[PDB]
From a paper:
Serine palmitoyltransferase ([name]) is the rate-limiting enzyme in the synthesis of sphingolipids. It catalyzes the transfer of a palmitoyl group to L-serine, yielding 3-ketosphinganine (3-KS). [name] is highly conserved across species and consists of two large catalytic subunits (in yeast: [name] and [name]) and interacts with a small regulatory subunit (in yeast: [name]). Here, we solved cryo-EM structures of the yeast SPOT complex in both monomeric and dimeric states and the monomeric [name] complex.
The lack of the [name]-TM1 helix swap, previously observed in human [name] complexes, results in weaker protomer interactions and explains the presence of monomeric complexes. Additionally, we also find one more interrupted N-terminal membrane inserted helix (TM0 with TM0a: T20-Q35 and TM0b: Q40-S49) in front of the TM1 helix in the monomeric species. Preceding the TM1, [name] folds into a short transmembrane helix (TM0b) that spans approximately half of the bilayer (15 Å in length) and leads through a short loop into another helix, that runs parallel to the membrane and is deeply embedded in the upper leaflet (TM0a). The deeply embedded helix [name]-TM0a directly interacts with three molecules of ergosterol in a position that would correspond to the upper leaflet of the ER membrane. The direct interaction of the [name] with ergosterol offers a potential explanation for the co-regulation of sterols and sphingolipids in yeast. In all of our structures, TM1-2 of [name] acts as a docking station for a 44:0;4 ceramide, which is sandwiched between [name] and the amphipathic helix of [name]. We propose that the two tyrosine residues function as gatekeepers controlling access to the previously discovered substrate channel. Finally, Orm2 is exclusively regulated through the endosome/Golgi-associated degradation (EGAD) pathway. Together with our interaction studies, this suggests that the monomeric SPOT and [name] complexes are the predominant forms in yeast.
Residue numbers in the entry:
A (entry chain B): 19 to 555
B (entry chain A): 39 to 222
C (entry chain C): 7 to 561
D (entry chain D): 3 to 76
Write the structure that this text describes.
């Protein structure tokens, strides 16, 4: 070997850079000369104490390439020639101005079955319309006993709390609701959140980290997508309700992990939901439970539209299939504004997860608590719903008749299709892939590939022409239905530039439990005629 | 086989000597977003003298025993500090509290000090203390060949060699002693 | 009997319960008016230090607790493992969390847990009523026995004292429950927008001074879902190191490159900007698309202002955009309660985007953003909370209309001024007296948040326990959120407390501090340059008439 | 403007003055002993620990002072 050669330059170049090295080494020599062993050990340690101290700061290597060969004259020129971009581009702000000028506004009345609307800054006024776009399905918050509980809570507790959940904010009435929800749905406990849209992005990242694995559905709503992005963990996908694909994917992951010989097994999850927000069909539970038990996976179900619509009483998907929520589902995320009738959201699970959630959840620790009258009003509705179950029976009966009326027809077979389920309370309609081509000349795959490439390249302007034409055509059908007949229906409002998964414009009709069979039957016929008149010509 | 849409897969080692791979764009933003709390207290007030105080107290406490000779009292306090320093700085990997995404979960505390910047004052102080302690101990109390040899081979391979800039971001894997390290 | 009991409402005549919630003024000499700071730069802050041995003792204590803490768990989980089934694998399923990630909450915070969360019943006025519990095991579970004792509070957020149960605001809310209901229609983009929402949007816009405004339903929701609308992988965001969590969650979701700068340095920022513009994007060396500067109107932990006159000049020389958050200053600071844009005299059109919430001052949950015209039009369509989330109820909105008008001076003649001078006077009086007794306090001489520093770790739980018996409520923080050396207790003033309660507060805190050896001051705190230790009677007799003058305050 | 619903705990000084305490021979030790019974206790981390650990720590401080002090004489 020749390793000794380089060490010589080092310790000679070290001593010459040091202002005096010959003398100090000579002094150490003569004082400890008995045995060389000693003199070697101390000549070393002190000197690298000196050389390391005398050195200069050194910065790490980053991605950005340094430019140390630039004089100050250049740096003043480069900084002056810079030209930024506008904060938000005003290039195409007028093209999408119709969607904000068509928003109906209600005038000095509660959102009920019969309201009065005006559109486009008080330019046009329509009176005594039939509402079919409301998102509440039971209408129990409008009864007298709920109102009296609200007024008394307001008088004795004021309007809103003024402290975070941490200390002063949680109060006696809060805890009462948590005990009450847990008892009603058969879970050990529950946690209240400020807003439903901030529930999934605030609980999923708490239990998920890098190195985990998550298996999610082919198409899910936006909040689920935001939760997956913030999770920072590997994410797979499987076809929409295809158990063979789920089995094949789970078999592959397990075999690879066994062969890996890893010390500590990571956390695994399965993410799906109940009645889908965009499609509105039902997910099979028994297959999911049997698969999660054999392959050792945890289950996560996000039911929002099925809390008060499914089952013989209104306890959700678990009751509908005749199972128990304690062992079937690990984590449940729901909402209160859709069915119960007040703002907020909650999470259901066993005791251990709730305890970890009180400290490790960002939306709960660093935010204020809900107002008092919201909590008391919901607790009253839960007690009323448990006492009697007539509203749920009526809602289920109307939903079945509505879907049967629009899906048993024959003359709309070449224009629209139904993509819902008989148990769902909202009916969605789309256009057949053949008719859309004849008037716009594009398909779903071409739209998805165009937008994905557009997002990846990070262009400053995002605009698709055929997609805008389909939206304008759908809005034309809605406007025609309202002008000639007093029926108000809405279209599925989406923001395309925020979506990652394939999606297509649609049209939806709502319902609730306070209508009558005669009124709903006539609204069905009027919408049928409106769809034909615009399309046939 | 199939690969995921978003992949954050930790990778093990395949060689005896391996280096933690440089982080990507997403990892860089996570680390830079939040100032760290493990390595912040090194620069704070009164965080340099405390090492001098601990050495003094340990020497007095060990000297309190009646039957201990001055040679073995120095060796004991050198043993306690070197072992204690190595455990705290170079052994526990990651962060105690919850850092976002667990980005700081493959580096030690020493390489986490002052944003991986080298040759900073704090690193100058912490590498200059044990050298002084070993020099004063071996000059103050006369040692034989066996004890001088042993204490040297603790001081060097325990307090100086790990802290050197060369050994930065280096992981040693032996098929039996330590498990396959996390390289990414 | 193991649950939190549901408390009954106390019964009394009308006059008695109008004095529990909002105390009347003693004398007309207890009012002060704020003056503008136009044309004067902001001096660098001055900080105080305690002697060396206090810091040395704190390091020794944490070292002892940490060493003892790890030892307990290793012996437990390795040898006696049948009482810890919730931290080990059970038949093929990984545990919910790991030991290291939870080494702090279990082992250094559990013993002090009785102070942190307290059940309360009643309206949070100037006296707050608390239920009683008795601690079992070591804070494993709590037993409740059914009594109520009032306590004076310094924790709740009612700056201007709108948290009342009998008055004009509550009359307007009760009338709404008849005309409207408590149910929201749905997403604002399809159905659920009423004229009430439009009126509040216009009123907020006129009040703050910008051209137009939008209204949301959660302060966390407002900030978290805002940044991804106009940022991408090609942008750069420069943010302070002491900002709120809601802002940070918006940025990490957006994905833009993030660079941070040390707090309070207006030089190192300039070195950061000149460097970043020249370097450009990574791995490609191309110019940045846009540069954004984020800051905060007032920091709660430190209680120091942001130098807006400097930031406005910097955002003009280098062509950078600016973003400001005023949640704790919108309604209670400035000469006429409008915010940082008023106290510093800067024109409102210089800032690009404004933000705020309603909880802290006006007394309702919500939030607003204000910007120019074309900025709002694009954001009304690019945002996701408008089209997917829910809408806010009516009673929360009805109060916000009947409060933004009182302070503005329309519905009530002379109550806004008589609610913006009192909070100014109290903050001036408490801060000067505590500095004179000998404590160490931070602030900017006007912030309602007054932090007091306690350094030793055992001294914090003792101080908190000792004063709930003395009938006063406080809140404390610890290492996971503050530096290792510096721990503090935080005070929140209100417009209801009067001079007498401050006197009653000052006497008790004086005796407690003397027992625990808490007054460790120096000459840097005072203005003459010499240490001071005054008697309690001299402080109470002289301070109320000397707090109005400015020359006595160091900063 | 002079009626509320809070009961005022009297200050620590006030209680003694009412009950009639104004004496001072062994009277100046009850209080001086109590003052010494807070300096030692507070600065050490005694509240955050457990009963078994605090028992060992108290014993440790006693023996260390004893050995240091008696060895001073001998
Ligand atoms: C004078 C006399 C004699 C001398 C004496 O006094 C008296 O001297 C006294 C002085 C004492 C020492 C004082 C201080 C320490 C340091 C401490 O430091 C903890 C460090 C913690 C964090 O460290 C890890 O951090 C990450 C998370 O684990 C790891 O990486 C991640 O990477 C990715 C991140 O996302 C993901 O993949 C994963 O998250 C993960 O992989 C990383 O590799 C690793 O560093 C870990 O601590 C735990 O480690 C074990 C596993 O968790 C615990 O469980 C296991 O412990 C035993 C294991 O065989 C068995 O019982 C069972 O199997 C099972 O129970 C164990 O209980 C406990 O120690 C460990 C104990 C020690 C040496 C004490 C020992 C006892 C003495 C020698 C006394 C002594 C009595
Ligand atoms: C052959 C074998 C012979 C056996 C002989 C026995 C020797 C006994 C060795 C004892 C070693 C004990 C070392 C314990 C260290 C464990 C610490 C692990 C904690 C992990 C936390 C990671 C990040 C937190 C860091 C942090 O914030 N730290 C700070 C607190 O917050 C930090 O703690 C403080 O500021 C103080 C820094 C004082 C520095 C002085 C070190 C000198 C050596 C002391 C050893 C004591 C040995 C006792 C026997
Ligand atoms: C007490 C132990 C730790 C001592 C003896 C070991 C130190 C190591 C780190 C030193 C000793 C010799 C050094 C050494 C020998 C030879 C060469 C070849 C030369 O072209 C570059 C430097 C290089 C590669 C260095 C690397 C670092 C080495 C291997
Ligand atoms: C008993 C133990 C403590 C002894 C054997 C330990 C010695 C280790 C630390 C030494 C021995 C050889 C050294 C060594 C060998 C080879 C190389 C490759 C070279 O390119 C850089 C230095 C490097 C990476 C160093 C690192 C430190 C090593 C691995
Ligand atoms: C020389 C013996 C007695 C040892 C134990 C004493 C001191 C050690 C710590 C010193 C002596 C020589 C030093 C030394 C030799 C050569 C090199 C190669 C160079 O490219 C980097 C520094 C490096 C790697 C340093 C590391 C620290 C060493 C190895
Ligand atoms: C209080 C806090 C929030 C919290 O918003 P809420 O509507 O009260 O939940 C938002 N922003 C800032 C700056 C805060 O301090």
């Amino acid at each position: 070997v020749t390793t000794s050669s380089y060490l010589w330059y080092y310790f000679n170049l070290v001593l010459t850079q040091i202002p005096g090295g010959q003398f100090i080494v000579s002094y150490i020599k003569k004082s400890h000369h008995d045995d060389p062993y000693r003199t070697t050990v101390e000549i070393g340690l002190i000197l690298y104490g000196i050389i390391y101290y005398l050195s200069k700061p050194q910065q790490k290597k980053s991605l950005q390439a340094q430019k140390p060969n630039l004089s100050p004259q250049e740096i003043d020129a480069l900084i002056e020639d810079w030209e930024p971009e506008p904060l938000v581009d005003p290039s195409a702000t007028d093209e999408q101005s119709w969607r904000v000028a068509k928003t109906p506004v209600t005038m000095e009345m509660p959102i009920q079955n019969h309201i009065t609307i005006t559109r486009n800054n008080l330019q046009e006024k329509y009176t005594n319309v039939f509402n079919l776009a409301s998102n509440n399905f039971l209408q129990l918050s409008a009864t007298e006993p709920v109102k009296e509980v609200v007024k008394t809570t307001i008088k004795n507790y004021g309007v809103g709390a003024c402290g975070p959940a941490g200390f002063y904010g949680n109060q006696d009435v809060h805890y009462t609701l948590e005990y009450d929800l847990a008892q009603f749905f058969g879970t050990q406990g529950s946690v209240l959140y400020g807003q439903d849209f901030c529930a999934a992005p605030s609980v999923l990242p708490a239990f998920t980290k890098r190195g985990d694995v998550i298996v999610a559905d082919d198409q899910v709503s936006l909040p689920v997508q935001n939760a997956l992005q913030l999770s920072r963990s590997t994410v797979y996908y499987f076809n929409h309700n295809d158990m063979n694909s789920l089995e094949c994917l789970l078999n592959e992951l397990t075999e690879q992990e066994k062969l890996e010989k890893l010390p500590a097994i990571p956390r695994k999850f399965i993410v799906t939901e109940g009645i889908f927000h965009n499609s509105g069909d039902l997910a099979p539970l028994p297959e999911l439970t049997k698969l999660k038990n054999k392959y050792k996976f945890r289950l996560f179900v996000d039911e929002t539209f099925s809390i008060g619509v499914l089952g013989a009483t209104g306890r959700g998907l678990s009751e509908h299939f005749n199972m128990d929520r304690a062992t079937a589902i690990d984590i449940t995320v729901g909402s209160m504004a859709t069915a119960l009738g007040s703002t907020g959201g909650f999470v259901l699970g066993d005791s251990v997860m709730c305890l970890h959630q009180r400290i490790g959840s960002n939306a709960y620790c660093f935010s204020a608590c809900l107002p008092a009258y919201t909590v008391t009003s919901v607790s009253k509705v839960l007690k009323l719903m448990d006492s009697n179950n007539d509203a749920v029976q009526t809602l289920q009966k109307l939903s079945k008749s509505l879907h049967d009326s629009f899906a048993s027809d024959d003359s709309l077979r070449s224009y629209v299709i139904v993509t819902s389920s008989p148990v769902s309370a909202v009916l969605h309609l789309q256009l057949t892939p053949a008719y859309r081509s004849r008037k716009f000349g594009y398909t779903c795959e071409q739209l998805f590939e165009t937008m994905s490439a557009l997002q990846k390249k990070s262009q400053t302007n995002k605009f698709i022409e055929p997609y805008e034409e389909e939206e304008k055509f759908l809005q034309s059908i809605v406007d025609h239905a309202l002008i000639n007949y007093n029926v108000l229906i809405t279209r599925n409002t989406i923001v395309l530039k925020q979506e990652t998964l394939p999606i297509v414009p649609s049209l939806k009709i709502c319902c609730n439990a306070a209508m009558s069979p005669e009124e709903l039957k006539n609204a069905c016929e009027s919408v049928k005629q409106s769809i034909l008149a615009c399309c046939q010509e | 086989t199939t690969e995921p849409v978003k992949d954050h897969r930790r990778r093990r080692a395949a060689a005896i000597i391996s280096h933690v791979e440089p982080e990507t764009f997403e990892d860089e933003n996570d680390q830079q977003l939040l100032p760290n709390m493990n390595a912040t207290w090194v620069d704070q007030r009164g965080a340099w003298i405390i090492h001098v105080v601990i050495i003094i107290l340990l020497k007095l406490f060990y000297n309190l025993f009646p039957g201990v000779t001055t040679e073995w009292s120095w060796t004991l306090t050198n043993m306690t500090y070197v072992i204690g320093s190595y455990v705290m700085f170079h052994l526990i990997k990651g962060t105690p509290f919850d850092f976002n995404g667990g980005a700081y979960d493959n580096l030690t505390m020493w390489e986490q000090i002052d944003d991986e910047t080298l040759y900073t004052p704090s690193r100058k102080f912490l590498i200059s203390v044990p050298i002084a302690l070993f020099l004063v101990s071996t000059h103050y109390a006369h040692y034989d060949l066996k004890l001088f040899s042993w204490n040297c081979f603790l001081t060097t391979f325990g307090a100086v060699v790990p802290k050197l800039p060369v050994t930065h971001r280096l992981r040693i894997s032996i098929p039996g002693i330590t498990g396959r390290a996390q390289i990414s | 009997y193991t649950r939190v009991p549901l408390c009954e409402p106390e019964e009394l005549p009308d006059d008695i319960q109008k004095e529990n919630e909002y105390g009347t003024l003693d004398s007309p000499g207890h009012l002060y008016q704020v003056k503008s700071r136009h044309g004067k730069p902001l001096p660098e802050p001055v900080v105080d230090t305690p002697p060396y041995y206090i810091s040395l003792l704190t390091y020794l204590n944490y070292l002892i607790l940490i060493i003892l803490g790890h030892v307990h768990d290793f012996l437990g989980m390795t040898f006696q493992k049948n009482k810890h089934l919730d931290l080990l694998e059970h038949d093929g399923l990984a545990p919910w969390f790991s030991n290291f990630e939870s080494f702090y909450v279990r082992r250094i915070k559990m013993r002090i847990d009785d102070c942190f969360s307290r059940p309360t019943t009643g309206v949070p006025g100037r006296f707050i009523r608390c239920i009683d519990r008795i601690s079992h095991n070591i804070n494993e579970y709590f037993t409740y026995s059914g009594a109520v004792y009032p306590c004076m509070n310094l924790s709740s957020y009612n700056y201007l004292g709108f948290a009342q149960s009998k008055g004009q605001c509550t009359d307007a809310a009760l009338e709404s429950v008849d005309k409207y209901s408590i149910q929201s229609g749905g997403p604002r983009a399809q159905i659920g927008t009423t004229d009430l929402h439009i009126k509040a949007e216009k009123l907020v816009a006129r009040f703050i001074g910008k051209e137009d405004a939008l209204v949301f339903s959660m302060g966390y929701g407002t900030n978290a879902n805002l940044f991804n609308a106009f940022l991408d992988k090609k942008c750069l965001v420069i943010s302070d190191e002491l900002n709120h969590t809601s802002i940070r969650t918006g940025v990490r979701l957006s994905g833009a490159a993030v660079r941070t700068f040390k707090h309070g340095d207006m030089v190192g920022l300039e070195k950061l900007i000149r460097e970043q513009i020249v370097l450009g994007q990574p791995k490609t060396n191309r110019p940045w698309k846009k540069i954004l500067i984020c800051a905060e109107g007032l920091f709660s932990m430190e209680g120091t202002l942001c130098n807006l006159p400097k930031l406005v000049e910097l955002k003009k020389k280098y062509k950078c955009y600016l973003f400001i958050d005023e949640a704790h200053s919108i309604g209670a600071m400035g000469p006429t309660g409008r915010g940082v844009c008023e106290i510093f005299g800067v024109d409102p059109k210089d800032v690009d985007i404004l933000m705020g919430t309603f909880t802290k001052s006006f007394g309702a949950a919500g939030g607003y953003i204000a910007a120019d015209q074309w900025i709002i039009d694009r954001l009304r369509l690019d945002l996701t909370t408008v089209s997917y989330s829910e809408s806010m109820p009516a009673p929360v909105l009805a109060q916000t209309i009947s409060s933004l008008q009182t302070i503005s001076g329309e519905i009530c003649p002379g109550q806004g001024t008589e609610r913006l001078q009192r909070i100014a006077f109290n903050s001036r009086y408490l801060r000067l007296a505590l500095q004179r007794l000998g404590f160490i306090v931070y602030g900017v001489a006007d912030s309602p948040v007054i932090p007091l520093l306690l350094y030793c770790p055992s001294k914090m739980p003792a101080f908190s326990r000792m004063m709930l018996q003395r009938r006063i409520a406080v809140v404390v923080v610890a290492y996971p959120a503050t530096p290792l050396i510096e721990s503090r207790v935080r005070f929140c003033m209100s417009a209801s407390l009067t001079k007498e309660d401050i006197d009653y507060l000052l006497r008790h805190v004086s005796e407690v501090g003397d027992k625990l050896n808490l007054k460790s001051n120096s000459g840097k705190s005072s203005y003459d340059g010499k240490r001071q230790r005054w008697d309690i009677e001299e402080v109470i007799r002289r301070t109320p008439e000397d707090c109005k003058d400015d020359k006595y305050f160091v900063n | 403007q002079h009626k509320s619903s809070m009961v005022y705990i009297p200050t620590t000084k006030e209680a003694k003055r009412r009950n009639g305490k104004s004496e001072g021979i062994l009277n100046t030790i009850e209080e001086v002993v109590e003052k010494l019974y807070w300096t030692y206790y507070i600065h050490l981390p005694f509240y955050l620990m457990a009963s078994f650990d605090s028992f060992f720590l108290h014993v440790f401080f006693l023996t260390i002072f004893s050995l240091s002090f008696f060895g001073i004489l001998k």
